[PDB]
Amino acid sequence: DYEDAVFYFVDDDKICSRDSIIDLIDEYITWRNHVIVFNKDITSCGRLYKELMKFDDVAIRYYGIDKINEIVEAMSDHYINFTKVHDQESLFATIGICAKITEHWGYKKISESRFQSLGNITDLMTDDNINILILFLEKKLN
């Protein structure tokens, strides 16, 4: 039952295990849909989720709002090839874009019909990208 999905990192203020990074991004991208679909309080989350939410701004800086709106329309075509994302700004923009897409779906009353549709998280979260992300988050959250 999607209503009863569990979010293990939602109240965390820290992350300090690289082996949790994929789980965290997977959950967080689901949460940006779920929080709209079930009208949960978007403010009831910890510093870790708040840091990830700032990647919305990174995506806007990187793409601009028109291209964002375009990419979201396309996905809802995989505009972004996760296997081609190899630097910090591109990585954070891509996480931001994924959050915008699943949030947008929630605004449109779309959820389960688009599960397993974004592409392979393991293509995005190479070991280097995992390291980029966790070092960044530790520096912000230390």
Binding site: D26, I29, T102, Q116, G119, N120
Partner: peptide, 9 residues
């Protein structure tokens, strides 16, 4: 767990 990613859930 469910997921929006194709290689998860």
């Amino acid at each position: 767990k469910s997921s929006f990613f194709s290689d998860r859930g």
